[PDB]
Amino acid sequence: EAAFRQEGVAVLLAVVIACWLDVDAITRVLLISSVMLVMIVEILNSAIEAVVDRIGSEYHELSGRAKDMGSAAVLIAIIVAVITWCILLWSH
Amino acid sequence: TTGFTRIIKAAGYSWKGLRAAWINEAAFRQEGVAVLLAVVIACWLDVDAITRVLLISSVMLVMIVEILNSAIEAVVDRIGSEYHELSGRAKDMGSAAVLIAIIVAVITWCILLWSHF
Amino acid sequence: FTRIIKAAGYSWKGLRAAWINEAAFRQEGVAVLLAVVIACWLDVDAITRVLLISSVMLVMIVEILNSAIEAVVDRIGSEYHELSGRAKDMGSAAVLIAIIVAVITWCILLWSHF
């Protein structure tokens, strides 16, 4: 997946970024755990998009709501990642 | 640009899928008020930024799981049309996952406000 | 309080299903409660106890979802041959990450305290 490599790039960098910076181990945890939290969901979204694909040829509101909600869940986690990182980096 | 157009389309799928989660389910609105209040509550109450995050990240996280549950109940509904007999365990376990996050949020908030207050 | 409370019964009957119907779920399940108790027995910063637990619980919340995914595949892949067998595999992948996070969290957090 090219977008998974696009987000995959986003995640590993952010992890590495949190590591070069000297910061409280607690905050390093929060930075990494926040970005990692995004990584777990995207995979689950990848997991959902996999099942939805297995059954059904046509469009549905029952089918596409699942993908759209799946795409929605990923979005929120990234906001958290953005917000978490913002509030945490605001102090420094 | 054509690498950044892929990202705005995901935002559109997210928005149309969030409002889908929002409108189609009444139970999703009950956590949202709890979450927005608790987030705003966590924002106006003065505490160290790490603790705000932990308060917010617990509260925001409960909301995140519920979205996945809405995604599962959507999938189970799809099989509700192709198949005839549903097992319901997926919905039942999905409902179980949501609970745990709230426990965490409560516990997170309990332990966090106890420490400071 | 009755409109939503049926879900709490749905949680229990769906959890007692998760506990009993799946045997492998108990190996991490035993591990988390231990990890929680351990995190509680250690005298530590309240924030870190949260972080230890919030890290360990995060594994737990996700794993139930894998049980939820593995359930859907079972109704479908009951008599059919799936090319999309990966959905279970992606589910197992998310859990691994959570445990990695937990390990790293506990690794990095316990390094700090000691």
Author numbering:
A (entry chain C): 28 to 119
B (entry chain B): 4 to 120
C (entry chain A): 7 to 120
Please share excerpts from the published article on this structure:
DgkA is a homo-trimeric kinase involved in phospholipid metabolism in Gram negative bacteria. The smallest known kinase, it consists of four helices, three of which are either fully or partly membrane embedded while the fourth resides at the membrane surface. DgkA is a promiscuous enzyme and, in addition to using diacylglycerol as a substrate, it can also phosphorylate the mesophase forming monoolein. Having long served as a model for studies of membrane protein folding, assembly and stability, DgkA was chosen as the test protein.
